[PDB]
């Protein structure tokens, strides 16, 4: 019993983290087979970042200008290309610790684990989500660029996120592993501002299902609603619109607890309009939206890897 913000075990990913230096700049890379992936801005000065021209900055560089360090030992770079906003450095050795893996582009509302790294060494693991405005609310100091977000299915690690930028807001932006940013962000130091951070409604409903499974039941109400009425009240609180696919995804949680999905929405409606009245739900005083419906099923049943 009990419910915690839980991240995947990071062992499979620890053994893929390297340090990449290009002259004055150092960040982290992902070494999978004989390729090392890292943010293309490794090749910039701090001055270069107000208006960099990456194709021109790259002509100065040769295979040997990139120093890749895997723990203690150096890897030899034999080839380098730029793909969108990531650099792919071809090394001579395949990583002996390469797990089974996939590159996936996730969608807003999905969650993943971040292995935070500095100079190729893992510092910590935490769970976060792709906000609807395509930022993530992470924990990233300078030198952490190149840390990756991942999901593990049994034996296969699905890489979905590489860290690249911190917005002046203190929130973060990055790419998938083919180098395309999530959302409208770019790897330049300019006036980029994130949009409205709305709350991920399906995830909140998932987390309320987790609550009644685990004891907290005071918020269960005597009301029901419809999707259209609920969504009226959800727009006023900057909550994602709830859709019929979200309803289906919550079916298994609905089935396990005997609480129809629309009844739980009516419970959620009243928490938005009346507040928490100083009470708690799973030890929080605000509504948590960083568990997906699959996270709840997994943690409440014992799924391993």
Residue 155 burial (CB count, 10 A): 10
Determine the length of the chain: 305
41 is annotated as an active-site residue = yes
Report in angstroms how near the CB of residue 284 gets to Cl ion at its nearest: 4
Q: Which residues contact 250 (CB under 8 A, 6 or more apart)?
A: 202, 205, 206, 209, 261, 264, 293
For the CB of residue 285, give the shortest distance to Cl ion in the complex, in Å. 4
Give the CA dihedral 240, 246, 252, 254, nearest 10 degrees: 60
Nearer to a copy of itself by Cβ, of 34 and 216: the residue is: 216
Give the distance from CA 70 to its chain's centroid: 24
- Residue 125: how many other CB atoms lie within 10 Å: 16
Residues 143-172 as x/- pattern, contact with a copy of itself by CB under 8 A: xx---------------------x---xxx
Please tell me whether residue 8 binds a copy of itself under the rule CB under 8 A: yes
Q: Which of a copy of itself, Cl ion, none sits in contact with 71, Cβ below 5 to 8 A by type?
A: none
Which CB, 148 or 281, lies closer to Cl ion? 281
Q: Does 303 bind a copy of itself (CB under 8 A)?
A: yes
Q: Say which DSSP state 179 is in.
A: S
Q: Can you tell me which of 139, 180, 226, 273 binds a copy of itself, judged by CB under 8 A? A: 139
Assign residue 120 a region (left: φ > 0; alpha: ψ between -120 and 50; beta: otherwise): left
Q: Stretches 40-48, 181-189, 201-209, 296-304: which one binds a copy of itself (CB under 8 A)?
A: 296-304
Find the angle CA(149)-CA(162)-CA(63) to the nearest 5 degrees: 135
| C-alpha–C-alpha distance, residues 19 and 142, integer Å | 14
Q: At 86, is the secondary structure helix, strand, or coil?
A: strand
Nearer to a copy of itself, 240 or 289 (CB): 289
Active site residue 163: no
3-state secondary structure at position 235? helix
Instruction: With CB under 5 A as the rule, give the number of residues binding Cl ion.
Output: 3
Sign of the C-alpha dihedral, residues 268, 273, 274, 277?
positive
In angstroms, the CA 81 to CA 66 distance is 12
Smallest distance, a copy of itself to C-beta of residue 100, A: 15
Does 276 bind Cl ion (CB under 5 A)? Our answer is no
Question: Rounded to the nearest whole angstrom, what is the least distance from the CB of residue 130 to a copy of itself in the complex?
Answer: 15
CB of 139 to a copy of itself, least distance (A): 4
Q: Output 17 or 77, the one with its CB closest to a copy of itself.
A: 17
Which span (51-59, 72-80, 240-248, 278-286) binds a copy of itself, by CB under 8 A? Answer: 278-286
CA neighbor of 206 nearest in space, from 290, 137, 140: 290
**Binding-site member from 27, 117, 194, 234 for a copy of itself (CB under 8 A):** 117
Separation of alpha carbons 47 and 44, rounded Å: 8
260 binds Cl ion (CB under 5 A): no
Q: Cite the active site residues.
A: 41, 145
List of residues contacting a copy of itself (CB under 8 A): 1-11, 14-15, 115-119, 121-126, 128, 137-141, 143-144, 166, 170-172, 214-215, 276, 280, 283-286, 299-305
């Amino acid at each position: 019993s009990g419910f915690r913000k839980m991240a995947f075990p990071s062992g499979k990913v620890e053994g893929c983290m390297v340090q990449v230096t290009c002259g004055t700049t150092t960040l982290n890379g992902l070494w999978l087979d004989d390729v090392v992936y890292c943010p293309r801005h490794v090749i910039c000065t701090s001055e270069d970042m107000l208006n960099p021209n990456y194709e021109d900055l790259l002509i100065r560089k040769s295979n040997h200008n990139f120093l890749v360090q895997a723990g203690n030992v150096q890897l030899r770079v034999i080839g380098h290309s730029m793909q969108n906003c990531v650099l792919k450095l071809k090394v001579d050795t395949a990583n002996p610790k390469t797990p089974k893996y996939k590159f996936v582009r996730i969608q807003p509302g999905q969650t993943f684990s971040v292995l935070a790294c500095y100079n190729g060494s893992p510092s910590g693991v935490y769970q976060c989500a792709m906000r609807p405005n395509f930022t993530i609310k992470g924990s990233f100091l300078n030198g952490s660029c190149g840390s990756v977000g991942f999901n593990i299915d049994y034996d296969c690690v699905s890489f979905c996120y590489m860290h690249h930028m911190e917005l002046p807001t203190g929130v973060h932006a990055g790419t998938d592993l083919e180098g395309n940013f999530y959302g409208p962000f770019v790897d330049r130091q300019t006036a980029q501002a994130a949009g409205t951070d709305t709350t991920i409604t399906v995830n909140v409903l998932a987390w309320l299902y987790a609550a009644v499974i685990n004891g907290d039941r005071w918020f269960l109400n005597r009301f029901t609603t419809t999707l259209n009425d609920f969504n009226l009240v959800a727009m006023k609180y900057n909550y994602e619109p709830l859709t019929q696919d979200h309803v289906d995804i919550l079916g298994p949680l609905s089935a396990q607890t005997g609480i129809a999905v629309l009844d739980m929405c009516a419970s959620l409606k009243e928490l938005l309009q009346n507040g928490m009245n100083g009470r708690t739900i799973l030890g929080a005083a605000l509504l948590e939206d960083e568990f997906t419906p699959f996270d709840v099923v997994r943690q409440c049943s014992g799924v391993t890897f």
